[PDB]
């Protein structure tokens, strides 16, 4: 619907559609994106007009007089009046041809009248629209287009049709209209609106969402350019400072004040077109000094400046003898001109060692601009030259009177010894024996000394930076350095490093939502301490005394993301620097070396990474035949000796169905997790569409037009996906040289378990527990992808994508830099200047764009080196965790590695490492050796394999077990090494009770 | 093992609390958003990396 | 650890910067400029443990 | 034809023809299986690979 | 261990000390440069915004403030780029550790 | 430095670290600003097919017990004369199995 009811404060409800609402612009229209803009979206009153109804009113902008307002009506001034209706040819006006009657400043009446026949200029009477002044056609606007949907009129005279400013009249005081329509559905609206700052989302030049920056959380939303804030910490300001006192501190001096009055007599005439023209014969009179009225120097310690204006009229003969009428009335003003200070700011405690005003240009450092301001324009007529010397002997004061006023222990605007700012000034006990004032490394005043008693005062900012904690789109806490309320929070607590304000009731056992270091913030706003992770400990290679061996194992799955490749870009240096202009190319022929260097660097980087990636990826046909969910769910490829197993997947299939590729995928060889990661984190690489011209070009086509070519990357993603699929399918490949003979996944898992530790319980095996744990872990991971490791992986991929996008965005936006030239467009420069003058302008653009390209190349090379190191790490991970079991401790995740699977991810891959997690320990009495006695011959026996622990069972029989898993086995004589001596920690035994 | 992470308030660095400078910087708010987002994401990634290493 | 932390290398409390009891030091001035160094003593303690 | 200059899946031969570059194929990795009919590499030749590190 | 303790208050000890000293110095200089970038005028009458607004009319002062804004944004972008590069290098070092 | 230590001065147990294939030895030469390594690897050109068994279920009347290969990296198979042999999986180097190559366990697998 087109009718909405304004909320408190005059804000459009979030449920609106903005069917007849546009963004007002003086230039080009944004097609899509989010923008923080100052737009007339504060709806004071919304007048709904029904079908066949009549809306007739005369509105003055300084007069919020309103007729009907569905909703509350504000009492502020109205800036823009908007008509949101289909302004077709079936809209009738009660004033005849006139649709709008404008009363401008000075009583001038202007009309916007549409006729069915063309009206000649300065004469009186498809629809052709005109601006009429006194019944004569003053300006031709054009025929009414068939698609007008909104007309916005501003109090300053600007007209916006469908969002674009097509004409501006004089500032308007009052607007009379009388309209009626019948084809405007059910209701059409007239909105009185005021400007406000808001974040607007636009899609296809149409408004979709308007977020007003009216609250603290909305301020954060506008600062982040998004209406959905992720949980985290955001920098904010503690408070806002306004309406503070003023403090002035100056060195002691005599008090003598001089008033300098400048008299300006302006001469005005009426031109042939009725515009008031200010005469250059206007006179300036300075105070008399040394028999002269043309030069005046300040000779006291303090001074003030004032201007008095008189007006006279002429009749094109430069004889001023009349009084200026309403049209010819003007007021004399003084503008800055080329001076480093303004005339109106001289009475603002500015200090000089010498200040003289003159009417002659010689010896002058700068000049002011004397101008006459009329009701419509402002014209410069004279020049007032200034000769000044920097110092502190002479000060300009607001008025004649001690100038030293100091406000303490409160926010104030200070001017101390020439340094100005906003801050709080306090008295300190410190004794600094040198200097008058002190500044920081950034040049900000930190303290100053009173020259009467030597007391040192410190200066601090009124407002400081704070950190706001946002969880679920609301502010729950704030870390700040000042013990004052902020962001609507009242309760607070003290921390050794800061103050923490919160919604929590402070005069806590909760799960923190957002954490950094040892600090955590929960959902209810409470502050919690984050301690270091605790673990049971590492198993030690001890074989003496009571030792513990892990026994009961479950499965843990850990997710890791590693980047493998970048998104390579080719740049045409000539097209980037010169937008196809032949003259710019001729100029760039002298810089051709720089373009050659840039192109060579980019091409060599791309070639090296392609060579690196090419040698890493490979597939196997037989492995790819088994790499699918359908293959793992059937027994077609199983060796006939596995007739008991229903299929390849078995009990593990419930977890393998989300990792293996399936036919229910957008692309080939794609799995569920891969689709989730490529859709929840991330377009078209066809270039033939850019040159078609069938629609407005998108961002990629525009970048191509700028000479920026993103090289193909879909092929690399397909190669990575097939590579990971082949790696997954090779686990179950029974033999290599023949057909696709497959083994059950359970058999491969058993082989991996035997590699970890020799399994000695052939009959009583429980792989169902491990399979169920794996299935539940994979299910949780899949749910989380659509678990800190999953969060870290997601953050890493998101960061990679964002950085890749921003790198090209910055380079593209660097093309709108003028680089101290009249324009950033080469065609514009060559269409306005002669070639000798235009070449100098084009040279600056050339140098700036070459510098930007060099910066982009350097950043790209650094990124490429980092990704090369990351690719080396990924290759090591694939070789030592997926294609084999590594003997390196802790390399394939935290725990005892069993096997790893891999999937393709944006610009890289993700690994699922499966580890054994112990849940119990067995305690055994371990011995370092056996001291065997056979009468007079006593000899020692040590375990040959240093990784085995020797212990004794209840029946006094020696057993050996590995320390990774508790898999006891009977010791034999071949497991021992005979040595001469014995250790004190050995277990005594006889020849009869020896193993084997 | 780790760096010394820094948070920057872009508005306070560019404008020393001046409201008029903030009004002017409302037209560059995108650059400040990019800077803050980059710094915050870098700090969060290193904190996540360090957290999983120590025990 | 003490030898390395004293022969090669301050205060991370922000509440002292806004007190105004003396002239601000380098860290407080940087804070005033909108530059916040995040806590690192906790990380050093974690590494030591 | 044998491509002379390649990038990704695109290759250009000496005669100007455009060819597709597919991923490298291999027989596969030997698996630690000791059940059923298995294959063990027997006849070996020597391959030399060159790597540069700064 | 006694010799190492004496040296800390043996080429490996010297290399370790040099590495830690370099890390600390680089970390300090990175922030020092950014802080000192705030006294650049960037072709304006002053590097203080309060000074500019106390001497010029708002139409004249906005043009002066725009140059400072652009210069400080450029300095912040440079600082961010350097920080990200340092972070990547330290990430590789952390993997080694 | 890792490459020199683990590929030139020794043979690394890491799979695929010293080139694509089964690493035999590496040599090194000096290059501008660095070095180049020649990695020598074994490239197989054929495969031998054997019938491998995961263990031996030995029966001695009423006492039935299992035997597993002590070294997990060895494949157990049978020759034409019904004699058990062990071979590594990297190279086909069959050898006669002895009692010291087996571990005795209670149960048997299918
Ligand atoms: C690498 O991987 C290993 C696992 O392989 C991780 O180690 C585990 O880490 C967790 C978390 O610290 C440990 O779990 C904790 O155990 C404490 C001891 O439990 C007692 O009570 C149980 C009752 O069933 C007994 O079985 C046990 O023997 C103990 O007597 C618990 O107290 C902890 O409880 C947690 O939850 C409760 C309820 O909310 C809280 O009150 C507690 O404060 C606490 O938060 C917790 O269960 C686990 O024991 C470790 N396992 C092993 C084998 O070491 C490593 O942490 C991981 N490393 C890294 C860096 O990630
Ligand atoms: C790591 O190192 C290994 C070697 O250790 C590499 O693996 C070899 O890769 C090559 C290239 O893919 C493989 O060679 C190909 O074998 C195909 C199968 O051959 C059939 O026919 C021969 C006939 O003698 C039989 O012996 C064999 O058993 C098969 O029945 C061939 O068809 C391929 O022919 C190529 O050339 C012809 C002629 O131009 C073309 O028509 C083909 O399309 C094709 O291009 C080719 O010979 C080789 O088998 C692999 N060896 C092993 C042991 O796997 C890895 O590729 C390498 N990895 C990386 C990443 O570099
Ligand atoms: C690059 O190499 C890969 C891997 O060897 C090739 O994949 C193969 O693609 C073909 C064509 O799609 C597949 O054969 C066909 O599949 C369909 C399935 O519906 C079937 O209808 C046909 O009878 C036929 O078998 C083939 O299975 C597939 N191979 C593997 C191992 O997955 C790919 O085609 C190669 N690309 C090029 C351009 O040569
Ligand atoms: C994420 O992992 C958790 C790990 O606990 C999974 O929860 C577990 O889910 C299984 C299957 O539904 C539950 O088993 C069932 O237990 C009940 C109670 O004993 C029993 O009556 C049922 O017959 C069945 O055996 C198991 O209890 C449950 N565990 C817990 C602690 O809740 C969860 O399913 C995983 N999520 C996904 C999406 O896979
Ligand atoms: C740094 O390492 C050197 C390694 O030599 C240490 O010097 C050694 O110090 C020990 C303990 O004082 C000396 O032992 C003594 O030797 C004399 C001579 O035989 C004997 O009379 C004493 O009863 C005692 O056994 C040892 O000789 C000495 N070695 C040398 C080559 O001087 C030195 O102490 C270490 N520094 C620190 C601060 O720990
Ligand atoms: C707005 O225009 C309507 C016509 O569209 C005006 O109504 C007319 O008023 C005159 C003068 O009294 C009558 O003679 C006509 O009969 C009226 N027409 C209709 C259709 O009612 C109306 O007065 C105008 N409103 C203003 C100027 O406030
Ligand atoms: C256009 O606006 C002018 C200025 O407000 C109006 O002229 C005023 O008319 C009122 C009528 O009571 C007088 O009291 C004022 O003195 C007039 N001002 C001037 C400057 O002369 C004028 O009537 C308006 N024209 C319309 C509504 O058609
Ligand atoms: C202007 O006309 C348009 C159509 O040209 C109106 O929009 C349509 O409104 C009807 C009735 O609700 C919908 O069924 C159509 O889908 C709308 N068309 C669109 C959205 O393209 C619009 O309401 C009219 N505006 C006014 C103010 O009367
Ligand atoms: C500025 O001052 C000059 C000089 O007095 C004025 O020009 C004189 O005007 C009078 C009166 O009309 C003439 O009689 C003289 O002949 C003029 N002198 C010259 C040299 O032209 C001028 O009118 C003043 N301008 C004002 C008051 O706007
Ligand atoms: C600097 O110190 C002098 C001396 O204390 C201050 O002058 C005093 O002002 C108070 C308040 O008006 C009077 O009661 C004292 O009698 C003054 N003492 C004198 C004149 O010796 C002076 O105000 C201080 N300056 C500033 C800027 O705070
Ligand atoms: C290892 O622990 C066992 C128990 O698990 C200890 O054996 C017990 O020792 C206590 C204390 O002397 C006796 O009261 C019990 O009778 C013992 N139990 C058995 C079954 O012998 C044993 O002493 C511990 N061993 C070591 C080396 O500390
Ligand atoms: C490892 O898990 C097994 C299986 O749950 C545990 O053995 C059972 O433990 C429960 C709880 O005490 C007893 O009720 C059962 O009688 C046990 N079953 C058997 C067959 O012994 C075992 O205790 C766990 N291991 C350790 C070292 O705690
Ligand atoms: C194994 O037997 C030897 C030999 O009897 C024991 O060594 C004796 O230890 C006692 C103290 O426990 C000494 O007083 C004897 O002199 C030792 N005898 C010799 C010949 O050295 C040894 O303690 C026994 N070990 C264990 C673990 O019980
Ligand atoms: C392993 O392959 C061998 C052949 O190399 C298979 O043995 C043959 O099996 C076929 C099909 O039953 C028989 O017709 C032949 O007589 C067998 N040959 C011999 C020499 O026995 C054997 O079946 C395969 N083993 C497995 C487990 O699949
Ligand atoms: C490994 O190579 C050997 C040596 O060439 C092969 O043995 C010969 O194979 C050829 C070709 O079939 C026969 O003509 C010869 O009689 C074979 N010689 C011997 C001594 O057996 C052998 O076949 C190859 N191994 C495999 C598994 O193919
Ligand atoms: C007055 C200053 C107090 C400083 C307190 C610091 C607390 C929080 C800062 C967290 C910033 C770390 C970056 C991650 C930000 C995020 O999660 O979005
Ligand atoms: C030549 C006789 C002495 C000169 C007198 C000058 C008059 C006023 C002194 C102004 C300077 C005050 C400096 C403050 C010194 C301090 O307290 O540390
Ligand atoms: C415009 O309409 C009037 C009134 O009906 C008519 O006299 C005139 O001819 C029309 N003009 C055109 C160009 O149709
Ligand atoms: C406007 O036109 C009318 C009618 O001809 C005329 O009397 C009047 O003088 C005109 N006004 C102006 C300001 O030219
Ligand atoms: C300014 O100072 C006066 C006293 O001189 C005080 O009443 C007033 O509140 C102050 N204004 C502020 C702090 O804004
Ligand atoms: C200067 O002008 C002021 C008013 O701004 C007036 O009070 C004063 O007397 C004038 N001084 C002269 C004319 O010398
Ligand atoms: C500063 O002086 C005040 C007033 O005498 C005193 O109360 C305070 O304790 C002093 N502070 C210090 C740090 O000496
Ligand atoms: C906070 O809790 C106290 C008691 O601890 C209670 O008196 C007070 O009303 C609470 N404040 C709230 C709910 O705002």
Task: Give the per-residue SS3 of A174-194.
Answer: EEEEEEEECCCCCEEEEEEEE
* CA distance readout (Å), A167 to A102, A151, A190, A510, F48: 14, 12, 20, 62, 89
Chain C interface residues (partner B, CB cutoff 8 A): 33-38, 40, 43, 46-47, 49
CB-CB neighbors (< 8 A) of A223 in chain B: 11, 29, 32-33
- Cα(B52) to ligand 1 centroid in Å equals 15
F/C Cβ contact: 3+ pairs below 8 Å: no
Structure tokens at A713: 């990357």
* Integer Cα distance of A189 and A48 in angstroms: 5
CB-CB neighbors (< 8 A) of A420 in chain E: 48, 50-51, 54
Distance from CA of E47 to the nearest CA of A (A): 9
CB-CB neighbors (< 8 A) of A759 in chain F: 68
Task: Please work out, in degrees rounded to the nearest 5, the angle formed at the alpha carbon of residue A872 by the alpha carbons of A870 and A876.
Answer: 115
Return all residues near A766 (Cβ < 8 A) that are at least 6 apart.
Answer: none
* Integer Cα distance of A489 and A500 in angstroms: 10
Structure tokens at A787: 């678990």
| CA dihedral over A497, A503, A509, A511, signed as positive or negative | negative
* Integer Cα distance of A149 and A164 in angstroms: 12
Neighbours of A733 (CB within 10 A): 25
* Burial (0-12, 13-18, 19+ Cβ within 10 Å), A222: buried
* Integer Cα distance of B14 and B16 in angstroms: 7
**Contact between B43 and C38 using a beta-carbon 8 Å cutoff:** yes
* Integer Cα distance of A346 and A399 in angstroms: 11
In whole angstroms, what separates CA A550 from the centre of its chain? 49
* Integer Cα distance of D6 and D24 in angstroms: 14
For ligand 1, atom 35: residue with the closest CA: A534
Structure tokens at A277: 């023209």
* Integer Cα distance of A764 and A265 in angstroms: 113
Would you say A916 and A898 are in contact if contact means Cβ atoms under 8 Å apart? yes
Residue A819's region, left for phi above 0, alpha for psi from -120 to 50, else beta, is left
Return all residues near A357 (Cβ < 8 A) that are at least 6 apart.
Answer: A260, A262, A286, A295, A296, A297, A384, A385, A386
Structure tokens at A611: 């060579």
Structure tokens at F106: 């209670």
Q: Give A112's strand partners.
A: A100, A131
* CA distance readout (Å), A111 to A54, A120, A213, A637, B48: 20, 16, 38, 87, 67
**Contact between B20 and E65 using a beta-carbon 8 Å cutoff:** yes
For ligand 5, atom 2: residue with the closest CA: E3
Q: Residue A168: phi, psi to the nearest 5?
A: -125, 130
Q: Residue A811: phi, psi to the nearest 5?
A: -65, -40
Q: Give D20's strand partners.
A: D10
D/B Cβ contact: 3+ pairs below 8 Å: no
Sole residue written with tokens 């006294």: E39
Neighbours of A992 (CB within 10 A): 7
* CA distance from start to end of chain D: 35
For ligand 18, atom 1: residue with the closest CA: A116
Determine which helix (DSSP H) or strand (DSSP E) holds A629, and give its type and residue range. helix A629-632
Structure tokens at A556: 């843990």
Out of A232, A421, A799, name the one closest to residue B45 (CB): A799
* CA distance from start to end of chain F: 49
Out of B41, B47, B49, name the one closest to residue A517 (CB): B47
B/C Cβ contact: 3+ pairs below 8 Å: yes
* Integer Cα distance of A238 and A231 in angstroms: 20
Closest-CA residue in chain F for A882? Answer: F15
- Cα(A981) to ligand 13 centroid in Å equals 13
Experiment type: cryo-EM
Sole residue written with tokens 């903005």: A18
* CA distance readout (Å), A956 to A925, A996, F3: 12, 13, 50
Out of A458, A481, A482, name the one closest to residue C23 (CB): A458
* Burial (0-12, 13-18, 19+ Cβ within 10 Å), A112: buried
Q: Give F76's strand partners.
A: F53, F86
Task: Please work out, in degrees rounded to the nearest 5, the angle formed at the alpha carbon of residue A701 by the alpha carbons of A713 and A563.
Answer: 25
Q: Is B6 helix (H, G, I), strand (E, B) or coil?
A: strand
Locate the ligand 10 atom nearest the alpha carbon of residue A457 and give its number: 28
Out of A442, A803, A859, name the one closest to residue E38 (CB): A442
CB–CB contacts below 8 A, A to E: 52
- Tell me, using a 6 A CB cutoff, whether residue A542 lines ligand 11: no
Q: Give A302's strand partners.
A: A257, A395
Tell which residue, A109, A140, A111, has the closest CA to residue A127. Answer: A140
* Integer Cα distance of A207 and A29 in angstroms: 12
Q: Give A448's strand partners.
A: A437, A457
| Ligand sitting nearest the alpha carbon of A879 | 2
Closest-CA residue in chain E for B38? Answer: E80
Q: Is A248 helix (H, G, I), strand (E, B) or coil?
A: strand
Would you say D20 and A715 are in contact if contact means Cβ atoms under 8 Å apart? no
Distance from CA of F108 to the nearest CA of A (A): 6
Distance from CA of E14 to the nearest CA of B (A): 19
Q: Is A468 helix (H, G, I), strand (E, B) or coil?
A: strand
Locate the ligand 11 atom nearest the alpha carbon of residue A923 and give its number: 5
* CA distance readout (Å), C34 to A409, A991, C37, E4: 22, 81, 10, 42
Tell which residue, F19, F42, F38, F16, has the closest CA to residue F29. Answer: F38
**Contact between E65 and B39 using a beta-carbon 8 Å cutoff:** no
* CA distance readout (Å), A284 to A242, A261, A295, A304: 39, 10, 11, 18
Structure tokens at A335: 């503008």
Three-class SS of B21-41: HHHHHCCCHHHHHHHHHHHHH
Sole residue written with tokens 């197993």: A645
Structure tokens at A369: 């601009």
Would you say A122 and A135 are in contact if contact means Cβ atoms under 8 Å apart? no
Q: Give A92's strand partners.
A: A180
Closest-CA residue in chain B for E92? Answer: B1
For ligand 23, atom 2: residue with the closest CA: A505
For ligand 19, atom 6: residue with the closest CA: A134
CB-CB neighbors (< 8 A) of D51 in chain F: 3, 19, 36-37, 39
Neighbours of E73 (CB within 10 A): 19
Q: Residue A116: phi, psi to the nearest 5?
A: -95, 0
Distance from CA of E10 to the nearest CA of B (A): 23
DSSP character string of A565-581: ----EEE-HHHHHSSS-
Would you say A829 and A842 are in contact if contact means Cβ atoms under 8 Å apart? yes
In A359-464, beta strands by DSSP E:
366-373, 378-396, 411-416, 419-427, 437-439, 445-449, 456-460
Task: Please work out, in degrees rounded to the nearest 5, the angle formed at the alpha carbon of residue A185 by the alpha carbons of A183 and A189.
Answer: 100
Would you say A675 and A661 are in contact if contact means Cβ atoms under 8 Å apart? no
Distance from CA of A872 to the nearest CA of C (A): 28
Tell which residue, A236, A201, A231, A209, has the closest CA to residue A220. Answer: A236
A882 secondary structure, DSSP code: I
* Integer Cα distance of A85 and A19 in angstroms: 10
Locate the ligand 3 atom nearest the alpha carbon of residue A669 and give its number: 32
DSSP character string of E46-80: -S-HHHHHTTS-HHHHHHHHHHHHHHHHHHHHHHH
Tell which residue, A743, A750, A745, has the closest CA to residue A643. Answer: A743
* Integer Cα distance of A880 and A232 in angstroms: 37
Tell which residue, A900, A677, A659, A697, has the closest CA to residue A775. Answer: A659
Entry field: residues in chain E: 97
In whole angstroms, what separates CA D6 from the centre of its chain? 15
Would you say A501 and A486 are in contact if contact means Cβ atoms under 8 Å apart? yes
Q: Residue A383: phi, psi to the nearest 5?
A: -135, 135
* Integer Cα distance of B30 and B13 in angstroms: 15
**Contact between B49 and E94 using a beta-carbon 8 Å cutoff:** yes
In whole angstroms, what separates CA A728 from the centre of its chain? 39
* Integer Cα distance of B46 and A792 in angstroms: 10
* Integer Cα distance of A12 and A143 in angstroms: 33
* Integer Cα distance of A771 and A767 in angstroms: 6
A816 secondary structure, DSSP code: G
Would you say A121 and A131 are in contact if contact means Cβ atoms under 8 Å apart? no
**What are the counts of helices (DSSP H) followed by strands (DSSP E) for chain C?**
3, 1
Buried b (16+ CB within 10 A) or exposed e, F80-101: eeeebebbebeebeeeebeeeb
- Cα(D50) to ligand 21 centroid in Å equals 93
Task: Please work out, in degrees rounded to the nearest 5, the angle formed at the alpha carbon of residue A461 by the alpha carbons of A460 and A465.
Answer: 125
Q: What angle do helix axes A767-785 and A788-813 make, rounded to 10 degrees? A: 30
**Contact between A441 and C20 using a beta-carbon 8 Å cutoff:** no
DSSP character string of A202-226: EETTEEEEEEE--SHHHHHHHHTT-
Out of A461, A792, A798, name the one closest to residue B48 (CB): A792
* Integer Cα distance of A575 and A916 in angstroms: 58
Would you say A499 and A482 are in contact if contact means Cβ atoms under 8 Å apart? yes
Q: Which chains touch D (3 or more CB pairs under 8 A)?
A: A, F
Would you say A384 and A282 are in contact if contact means Cβ atoms under 8 Å apart? no
* Integer Cα distance of A26 and A29 in angstroms: 9
Return all residues near A918 (Cβ < 8 A) that are at least 6 apart.
Answer: A550, A551, A552, A553
Tell which residue, A124, A121, A123, has the closest CA to residue A97. Answer: A124
Buried b (16+ CB within 10 A) or exposed e, A792-802: bbbebbbbbee
Sole residue written with tokens 């209810």: A524
Tell which residue, A877, C8, A995, A990, has the closest CA to residue E9. Answer: C8
* Integer Cα distance of F47 and A28 in angstroms: 71
| CA dihedral over A313, A316, A318, A319, signed as positive or negative | negative
* Integer Cα distance of A386 and A475 in angstroms: 54
In chain D, beta strands by DSSP E:
5-7, 10-12, 18-20, 24-25, 36-41, 44-53
* Residues with a CB atom less than 6 Å from ligand 9: A 265, 267, 281-283, 312, 319-320
* Integer Cα distance of A928 and A941 in angstroms: 9
A650 secondary structure, DSSP code: G
In whole angstroms, what separates CA A684 from the centre of its chain? 24
Tell which residue, A315, A328, A325, A342, has the closest CA to residue A377. Answer: A328
* Burial (0-12, 13-18, 19+ Cβ within 10 Å), A323: exposed
- Residue A341: CA count within 13 A, CB half-sphere: 22
Sole residue written with tokens 């169902």: A768
Structure tokens at F68: 């597993």
Buried b (16+ CB within 10 A) or exposed e, A64-89: bebeebebebbeeebbbbbbbbbbbe
Residue D15's region, left for phi above 0, alpha for psi from -120 to 50, else beta, is alpha
* CA distance readout (Å), A705 to A575, A623, A687, A690, A708: 8, 44, 11, 9, 7
Q: Residue A488: phi, psi to the nearest 5?
A: 80, 5
Sheet holding A499-502, edge to edge: A232-237, A465-471, A474-480, A499-502, A491-494
* Integer Cα distance of A296 and A287 in angstroms: 7
* CA distance from start to end of chain A: 93
Determine which helix (DSSP H) or strand (DSSP E) holds A962, and give its type and residue range. strand A958-962
- Tell me, using a 6 A CB cutoff, whether residue C35 lines ligand 16: no
DSSP character string of A10-28: S---TT---TT----BSSP
Chain A interface residues (partner B, CB cutoff 8 A): 36, 38, 197, 222-225, 232-235, 237, 240-242, 421-422, 444, 461-463, 465, 467, 515-517, 532-535, 788-789, 791-792, 795-796, 798-799, 802-803, 806
Interface test with D, best of F46, F86, F93, F101 (most D CBs within 10 A): F46
**Contact between A465 and C13 using a beta-carbon 8 Å cutoff:** no
Neighbours of A483 (CB within 10 A): 12
């Amino acid at each position: 619907t087109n009718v909405f009811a304004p909320t408190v404060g005059g804000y459009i409800p979030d449920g609106f559609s903005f069917n007849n609402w546009f963004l007002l612009t003086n230039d080009s229209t944004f097609v899509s994106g989010r923008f923080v803009t100052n737009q007339p979206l504060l709806v004071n009153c919304l007048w709904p007009v029904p079908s066949f109804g009549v809306a007739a009113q005369e509105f003055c902008f300084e007069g919020a007089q309103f007729s009907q307002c569905n909703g509350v009506s504000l009492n502020n001034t109205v800036d823009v009046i908007r008509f949101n209706l289909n302004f077709t040819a079936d809209v009738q006006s009660g004033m005849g041809a006139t649709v709008f009657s404008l009363n401008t400043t000075g009583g001038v009446i202007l009309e916007i009248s549409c006729y069915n026949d063309t009206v000649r200029e300065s004469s009186f009477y498809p629809k052709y629209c005109y601006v009429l002044y006194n019944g004569t056609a003053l300006k031709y606007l054009g025929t009414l287009p068939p698609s007008v949907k909104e007309i916005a009129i501003s109090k300053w005279g600007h007209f916006y049709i469908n969002g674009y400013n097509f004409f501006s009249t004089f500032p308007i005081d009052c607007i009379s209209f009388n309209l009626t329509t019948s084809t405007s559905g059910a209701f059409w609206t007239i909105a009185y609106t005021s400007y406000t700052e808001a974040l607007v989302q636009v899609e296809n030049t149409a408004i979709k969402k308007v977020t007003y920056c009216n609250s603290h959380i909305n301020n954060i939303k506008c600062s982040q350019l998004t209406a959905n804030l992720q949980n985290g910490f955001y920098p904010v300001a503690s408070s806002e400072v306004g309406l503070v006192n003023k403090s002035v501190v100056l060195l002691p001096s005599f008090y003598s004040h001089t008033s300098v009055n400048i008299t300006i007599d302006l001469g005005m005439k009426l031109s042939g077109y009725g515009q008031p023209i200010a005469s250059a014969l206007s006179n300036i009179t300075l105070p008399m000094q040394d028999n002269n009225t043309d030069v005046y120097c300040i000779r006291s310690n303090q001074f003030s400046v004032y201007v008095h204006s008189t007006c006279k009229s002429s009749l094109w003969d430069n004889v001023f003898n009349s009084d200026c009428t309403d049209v010819l009335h003007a007021t004399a003003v003084i503008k800055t001109g080329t001076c480093p200070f303004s005339f109106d700011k001289l009475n603002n405690y500015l200090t000089f060692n010498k200040f003289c005003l003159s009417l002659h240009p010689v010896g002058a450092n700068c000049k002011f601009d004397v101008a006459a301001r009329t009701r419509t324009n402002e014209q410069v007529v004279r020049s007032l030259y200034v000769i000044y010397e920097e110092g502190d002997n002479i000060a300009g004061v607001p008025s004649d009177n001690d100038l030293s006023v100091l406000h303490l222990d409160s926010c104030t605007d200070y001017n101390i010894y020439g340094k100005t700012g906003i801050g709080i000034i306090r008295q300190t006990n410190s004794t600094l024996l040198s200097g008058l004032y002190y500044t920081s490394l950034s040049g900000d005043l930190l303290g100053f000394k009173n020259v009467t008693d030597g007391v040192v005062y410190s200066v601090t900012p009124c407002d400081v930076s704070a950190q706001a904690a946002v969880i679920d789109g609301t502010i729950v806490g704030a870390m700040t350095s000042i013990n004052s309320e902020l962001l609507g929070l009242t309760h607070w607590t003290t921390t050794p490093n800061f103050y923490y304000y919160s919604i929590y009731n402070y005069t806590v056992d909760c799960e923190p939502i957002i954490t950094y270091s040892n600090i955590g913030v929960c959902k209810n706003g409470a502050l919690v301490f984050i301690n270091v992770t605790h673990s049971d400990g590492d198993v030690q290679p001890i074989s003496t005394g009571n030792v513990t061996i892990p026994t009961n194992f479950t499965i843990s799955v850990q997710v890791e993301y590693i980047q493998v490749y970048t998104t390579p870009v080719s740049i045409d240096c000539s097209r980037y620097v010169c937008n196809g202009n032949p003259r710019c190319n001729k100029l760039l022929t002298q810089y051709v070396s720089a373009c050659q260097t840039i192109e060579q660097a980019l091409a060599m980087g791309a070639r090296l990474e392609n060579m690196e990636v090419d040698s890493m990826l490979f597939v196997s046909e037989n492995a790819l035949k088994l790499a699918s969910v359908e293959a793992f769910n059937s027994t077609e490829h199983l060796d006939p000796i596995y007739k008991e197993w229903p299929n390849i997947g078995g009990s593990w299939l419930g977890g393998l169905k989300d990792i293996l590729p399936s036919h229910n995928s957008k692309r080939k060889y794609r799995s569920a997790i891969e689709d989730l990661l490529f859709d929840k984190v991330v377009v078209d690489e066809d270039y033939k569409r850019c040159t078609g011209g069938y629609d407005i070009a998108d961002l990629v086509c525009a970048q191509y037009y700028n000479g920026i070519m993103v090289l193909p990357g879909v092929a690399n993603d397909d190669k990575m996906t097939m590579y990971t699929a082949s790696l997954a399918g090779g686990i179950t490949l029974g033999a290599l040289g023949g057909g696709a003979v497959a083994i059950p996944f359970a058999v491969a898992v058993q082989a991996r378990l035997n590699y970890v530790a020799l399994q000695t319980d052939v009959l009583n095996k429980n792989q169902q527990i491990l399979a169920n744990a794996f299935n539940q872990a994979i299910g949780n991971i899949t749910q989380a992808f659509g678990l800190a490791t999953v969060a870290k992986a997601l953050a890493k991929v998101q960061d990679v994508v964002n950085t890749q996008g921003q790198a090209l965005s910055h380079l593209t936006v660097q093309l709108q830099n003028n680089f101290q030239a009249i324009s950033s467009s080469i065609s514009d420069i060559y269409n306005r200047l002669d070639p000798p003058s235009a070449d100098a302008q084009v040279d600056r653009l050339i140098t700036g764009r070459l510098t930007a390209l060099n910066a982009f190349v350097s950043q790209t090379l650094t990124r490429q080196a980092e990704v090369r190191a990351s690719r080396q790490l990924a290759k090591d991970k694939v070789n030592e965790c997926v294609r084999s079991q590594s003997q390196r401790f802790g390399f394939c995740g935290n725990g005892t590695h069993l096997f790893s699977l891999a999937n393709a991810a944006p610009n890289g891959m993700i690994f699922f490492h499966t580890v054994l997690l112990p849940t119990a320990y067995e305690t055994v009495t371990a011995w370092s050796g056996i001291c065997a006695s056979d009468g007079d011959h006593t000899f020692g026996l040590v375990v040959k394999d240093v990784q085995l622990t020797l212990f004794r069972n209840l029946d006094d029989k020696f057993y050996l077990t590995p320390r990774t898993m508790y898999q006891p086995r009977v010791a034999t004589i071949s497991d021992f090494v005979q040595i001469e001596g014995c250790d004190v920690l050995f277990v005594n035994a006889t020849v009869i009770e020896l193993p084997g």
